[PDB]
Amino acid sequence: MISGILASPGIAFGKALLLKEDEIVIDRKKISADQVDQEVERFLSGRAKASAQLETIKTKAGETFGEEKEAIFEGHIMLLEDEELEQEIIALIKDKHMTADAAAHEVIEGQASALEELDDEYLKERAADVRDIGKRLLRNILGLKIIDLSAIQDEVILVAADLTPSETAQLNLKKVLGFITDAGGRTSHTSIMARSLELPAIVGTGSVTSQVKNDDYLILDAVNNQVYVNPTNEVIDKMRAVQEQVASEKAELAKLKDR
Looking at the record's lineage, which domain of life comes first? Predict the structure, then answer.
């Protein structure tokens, strides 16, 4: 079947919520000196909103997990406000006649690749987290729609190949019944949420993200390390009784202490 790494015990039932994102496309058209002024406004002005959005998330990381994680997000903000990167990005637009989205991606292309050459869990993770900062800037300059994961109204299971610390830091723990992703690794941030929250979870799904679609009915067994896809009603009744029978057994244990 599908055997994952089992993060925490606990049976849960819910629909599959797949997170689908459209790839970002960069425009490589060369602009004229007349539109160059517009690129700087979108860039300088974009930082106005990006600095604010990233700044708000920074607090969520501290109010959600504690000051220990808040320091990591504070460092990312320093990169965006580095006066050094600003001069380089501005020069590329005016020197190479590149669009703000195009010039910005070039700088981000080397910042991420450079961090990958370091063999440290902190610096390496910074490579992936830094790339995320560039994606946020690109999404704001083009006015791309932003997915608000905190606006979920139906409790369901969250399924994704992997979540980045920023997305996990802003995830709403009250609207998600559990997490099931295909990132079985000690460095998987999703696994860390499960250990601190002890909520039932799995990460070594392997390739379930490539075999399930949003709205699929999934049962998390968190007992024998197996997930059921498209289970029959007869099978659902069998699993529903096992988890529920456990809750009733706890009440009976209180009466067995007097004999």
Answer: Bacteria
Determine whether 189 is an active site residue: yes
The strand order across the sheet containing 201-202 reads 201-202, 176-181, 156-160, 12-18, 217-220, 227-229
Resolved by: NMR
Encoded amino acid at 155, one letter: E
Measured CA to CA in angstroms, residue 131 lies from 17, 50, 106, 108 at distances of 25, 14, 11, 6
In the chain, the domains with their CATH numbers are 3-20+147-249 (3.50.30.10), 21-146 (1.10.274.10)
Give how far Cα 141 sits from Cα of 39, 100, 109, 211, 218, Å: 9, 8, 17, 34, 38
- What are the DSSP E strand ranges found in the chain? 12-18, 156-160, 176-181, 201-202, 217-220, 227-229
- How far is Cα 101 from Cα 133, in angstroms, rounded to an integer? 13
Contact 30, 94 (CB under 8 A): no
